[PDB]
Design a protein. Structure first.
Ligand SMILES: [Mn+2]
Ligand SMILES: [Mn+2]
Ligand SMILES: [Mn+2]
Ligand SMILES: [Mn+2]
Lengths: 358, 358
């Protein structure tokens, strides 16, 4: 099974990293144990969607390409390692974003920095280590691979894009013209920057590059198949599926009970430029906009309840269904275009869409 | 002048980074301005010792190697860019370490995260961007260079080592056997881990790799001269000079007035494994150790004053002078050994020592 190989490689990668800390970085056993627990707590327990996308893309090409058995095994091992690079990159983001946002829970468990023996003082550095481990992995496992340079270059550009996206995200409730390191940032009062275009830019950089583009292209690279596809189509379809992913996340933040969500959603309190706020402001009458402005972005539970009420009364299910229908058209169109050069890869993308959509 | 070229390249690198944000990352002008101010505030204003070491090593080899003039200029430009990679890496560390430690000032100015329009929520991500910029620089300026892979590999291993060193540093006041993410960490009461060996491990990883080893080897790489030297000697001498650097920093933290230091030193309050504490515990009688334990690691100003008194009464100037004399012997010995294969590089190391020592 794909999952079974993927999880076995985690054990191998963990052992390599911790053994190297002992043999080359002079680490002692208690700190090795701390880092092992940190790695498990921050990297394990999700769905491994991103990492497994690398594996699944690679498996698709193995099914139609002649290889020695040892080569099949090496490609699958490379896909697993590259998948864990992305999972560790996500772990880095989640650790640091939870600190930056003051989040409380993540996947039914306390955020890493809130563990009693961690604290922010250690957790910021723990998140730095998680990202450094992605590079240690690559240089060790891919040292002699022909895709090493392309993979490292891709990884770093996606990582940079994601940090730029985090800036877009955490500043999305400020007026751009008032941004200034010397002046404490007030929340917007006109919400003029709550537009579809601006929302799409947040999501594209914050989410879609590392969640959809990177796993797909990494699967191509470890398969030596990047010339088998039109890269502009891979970008466009990743952008599309990633945006749909984030729209779903945004809806759930407001409307999924905390036990199922795994956290208490705070997008309203945090004044996020979410799909609900943008779409509501694309629909609302004057009265409703005024009420939204009077209540959005405040921890006060009665104000949050007014915003959720406005959202419920706004029939945003209709907008979501129409958004979803348009995304189905465009994603299907792009999958069709991908078949011109690689039916195999087009099928992998169809699977990524089906897992995202349904 | 070397400094004049180095600072000119900053302007060039800044322009490249910000222009690329506009042309490829969809940035708007106010956020470009924020990032420009962030870059200037976090990267400028120090001595540029690390960055200029790259330049000076490269200049040493230019003086004795035949090159076309355009090649001399390209090598110096590469040395400047590689120097700014290290300066931006340091900027990353300082931003994140100041947040992790709750520091107040850095170089006579508030720490970046304490700017009113920054906040920890933005500053953690700003520090992430600073490090991502080091990689954007390398891939853009060194794309076709033969040293690209060696440089990237070196940079990432030094970066990893530094994060491991930060872990050693911020955990240095806890008993290793009690380290545990599930349990809030108490300060040591026996100080058994305040030893020269353990202190040297903190310093080696936290400081010496990125402050001394990386600039020296980067200067070799951009000069295509790494085979001109014995790398084990470069490591040993970097370790030695870097440790002396940190010992000086530790003394100043306790004894240099804040205006000259640029901050209010808090190593005693923070219970740091500093050279003063280790050396004091290497000298003290039972009575003095007991008093140290009763007062170390507490913000209470009268307790800090008791520790400073113990340090003053302990005649640690004698230990420092004897430490310094031994470092002079060993550094001179290693410079002599370096002359066997490269007098030019040995001279660059002598300059790095002279700037550190005097
Ligand atoms: Mn966030
Ligand atoms: Mn969300
Ligand atoms: Mn620190
Ligand atoms: Mn210090």
């Amino acid at each position: 099974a794909s999952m079974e190989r993927f999880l076995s490689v985690y054990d191998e990668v963990q052992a390599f990293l911790l053994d190297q800390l002992q043999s080359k970085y002079e680490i002692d056993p208690n700190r090795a144990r701390y880092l092992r627990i940190m790695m498990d707590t921050t990297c394990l327990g999700g769905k491994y969607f991103r990492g497994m996308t690398v594996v699944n893309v690679a498996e698709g090409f193995l099914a139609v390409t002649q290889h020695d058995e040892a080569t099949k095994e090496r490609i699958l091992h490379d896909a697993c390692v590259g998948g864990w690079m992305i999972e560790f990159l996500q772990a880095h983001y989640l650790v640091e974003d939870d600190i930056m946002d003051g989040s409380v829970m993540r996947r039914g468990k306390p955020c890493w920095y809130r563990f009693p023996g961690v604290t922010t003082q250690c957790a910021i550095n723990d998140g730095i280590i998680l990202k450094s481990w992605t590079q240690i992995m690559a240089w060790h496992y891919f040292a002699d691979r022909p895709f090493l340079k392309d993979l490292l270059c891709l990884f770093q550009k996606v990582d940079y894009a994601t940090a730029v996206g985090q800036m877009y995200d955490v500043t999305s409730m400020c007026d751009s013209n008032k941004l200034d390191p010397e002046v404490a940032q007030p929340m917007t009062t006109d919400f003029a920057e709550f537009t579809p275009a601006i929302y799409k830019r947040i999501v594209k950089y914050k989410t879609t590059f590392y969640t959809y583009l990177l796993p797909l292209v990494m699967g191509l690279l470890v398969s030596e198949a990047a010339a088998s596809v039109e890269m502009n189509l891979v970008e466009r379809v990743a952008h599309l599926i990633g945006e749909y992913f984030q729209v779903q996340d945004d809806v759930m933040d407001c409307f999924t009970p905390p036990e199922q969500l795994g956290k208490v959603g705070t997008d309203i309190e945090d004044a996020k430029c979410s799909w609900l706020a943008v779409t509501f402001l694309g629909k609302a009458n004057a009265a409703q906009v005024a009420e939204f402005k009077a209540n959005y972005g405040e921890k006060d539970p009665a104000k949050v309840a007014v915003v959720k009420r406005l959202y419920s009364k706004a029939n945003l299910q209709a907008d979501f269904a129409a958004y979803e229908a348009e995304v189905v058209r465009e994603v299907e169109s792009l999958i069709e275009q991908l078949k011109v050069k690689s039916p195999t890869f087009a099928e992998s993308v169809a699977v990524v869409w089906e897992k995202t959509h349904k």
